[PDB]
Amino acid sequence: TIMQEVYSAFLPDGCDHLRDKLGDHQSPATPAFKSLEAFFLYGRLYEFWWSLSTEEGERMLSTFKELFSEKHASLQNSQRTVAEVQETLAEMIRQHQKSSLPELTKRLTEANQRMAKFPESIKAWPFPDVLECCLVLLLIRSHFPGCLAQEMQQQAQELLQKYGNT
Amino acid sequence: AEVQETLAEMIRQHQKSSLPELTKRLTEANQRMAKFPESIKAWPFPDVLECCLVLLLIRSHFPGCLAQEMQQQAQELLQKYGNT
């Protein structure tokens, strides 16, 4: 409600006004703007869920398709796995003080390689939680029987079942 | 030490009231200790497995370094002894 307030106050309309002038392949600072717009979309998505708990249907739901960013959820997945492995090793050191490794190292060597494969644009500029957004989209779709969200629901399902499975 | 604690707990449970492999473990551990010279036994040393764990933790913070063969040595030492 402060993330929402900033958008509602300093940019009441869409962010596309800031895209044509500079972000339309005019400056190398166009990726960061996307993140801002993405964050905006994220907030709007949550607002729609807050409305559910019809008028803004397929017309508005088609704007969130850019937010999924399959190439961007892998980064969050890798960071989460790396953080959980670091926590596991810290707990191992704590248990050694008070007193699975091969696959753990394979996971690390795949996650670090995947992170290195991404360019600096993805790593440097933030983004909202993609899997949480997919979960909220699925929750909203569950409240609309028979809509099926066309291929958007399929994309959300495959992104949610490919990365971050627990 | 863990086997001695296990036997002490067995005696306590007998007071208030796996052995073949335990004895095999003892007869291998005592033999391994006897095989070492007095230099290793008499003079202390920091916890090697904990040091390997800290090295792995530090390496996890550096992506792509791989520590060359040092990481491999730490991994094999950690997965060969003290596995739990």
One DSSP character per residue, A57-112 reads: SHHHHGGGGGG--HHHHHHHHHHHHHHHHHHHHHHHHHHHHH--HHHHHHHHHHHH
Q: Give the rounded distance of the alpha carbon of A37 from its chain centre.
A: 12
Find the angle CA(B83)-CA(A79)-CA(A134) to the nearest 5 degrees.
120
Distance set, CA B44 to CA B41, B48, B53, B83 (Å) = 7, 11, 19, 22
Q: Between chain A and chain B, how many beta carbons pairs sit less than 8 Å apart?
A: 35
CA–CA separation, B31 vs B14, rounded Å? 30
Q: Does A98 touch chain B (CB under 8 A)?
A: no
Q: Please answer whether residues B80 and A116 qualify as being in contact, where contact means their C-beta atoms are separated by less than 8 angstroms.
A: no
The distance of A77 to chain B (nearest Cα, Å) reads: 16
Is the CB of B64 inside 8 Å of chain A's CB atoms?
yes
Distance of alpha carbon B30 from alpha carbon A151, whole angstroms: 66
Q: How far is residue A21's CA from residue B46's CA, in Å, rounded to a whole number?
A: 62
Residue at B17: amino acid letter: S
- Measured CA distances, A163 to B24, B26, B45 (Å): 46, 46, 44
Closest Cβ–Cβ partner in B53, B60, B75 for A96: B53
CB contact under 8 A, A89 and B57: yes
Instruction: Provide the 10 A C-beta neighbour count for residue B75.
Output: 19
Q: CA of A108 to nearest chain B CA: how many angstroms apart?
A: 7
C-beta of residue B56 within 8 angstroms of C-beta of residue A100? no
Q: What span, in angstroms and rounded, lies between the C-alpha atoms of A162 and B30?
A: 50
CA distance A107 to A86: 12
Helices assigned H by DSSP within A2-29? 3-10, 17-18
Cα of A95 vs its chain's centroid, Å: 35
* A96 contacts B64? CB cut-off 8 A: no
Token duo for residue B60: 């996890």
CA distance A67 to A128: 9
Q: Is A100 near chain B, with CB under 8 Å?
A: no
Q: What's the gap between Cα A145 and its chain centre?
A: 25
Is residue A83 less than 8 Å (CB to CB) from chain B?
A: no
Q: Is the dihedral of CA B57, B60, B61, B64 positive or negative?
A: positive
Closest-CA distance, A23 to chain B, in angstroms, reads: 31
CA A50, A137, A128, B60 dihedral sign is: positive
Note whether A93 contacts B: Cβ–Cβ < 8 A.
yes
Exposed/middle/buried for residue B56 (C-beta within 10 Å: 0-12, 13-18, 19+):
buried
**C-alpha–C-alpha distance, residues A59 and A155, integer Å:** 18
Of chain B, the end-to-end C-alpha distance in Å amounts to 15
Q: Which amino acid is at A36?
A: L
Contacts of A105 in chain B (CB under 8 A): 56, 75
CA–CA separation, B77 vs A103, rounded Å?
A: 16
The two three-digit tokens of residue A43, written as one number: 């907030």
Residue A163 DSSP SS3: coil
Q: Which two tokens stand for residue B78?
A: 């950690």
**Residues of B whose CB is below 8 A from A109:** 66
Distance from CA of A94 to the nearest CA of B (A): 9
- Buried-state track A114-153, b at ≥16 Cβ within 10 A, e below 16: ebeeeeeebeebebbebbebbebbeebbeeeeeeebeebb
Element (H, E) at B27: helix B19-35
User: Nearest CA of chain A to the CA of B67: how many Å?
Assistant: 12
Q: Say if B60 is an interface residue toward chain A (CB within 8 Å).
A: yes
- Rounded to an integer, what distance in angstroms lies between the CA atom of residue A54 and that of residue A51? 10
Residues A63 and A51: their CA atoms lie apart, in Å, by: 17
Resolution in A: 3.3
Alpha-carbon gap, residue B24 to B30, rounded angstroms: 10
Quickly count: other Cβ atoms within 10 Å of residue A74's Cβ: 21
How far, CA to CA in Å, does A66 sit from each of A133, A155, B18? Answer: 12, 11, 60
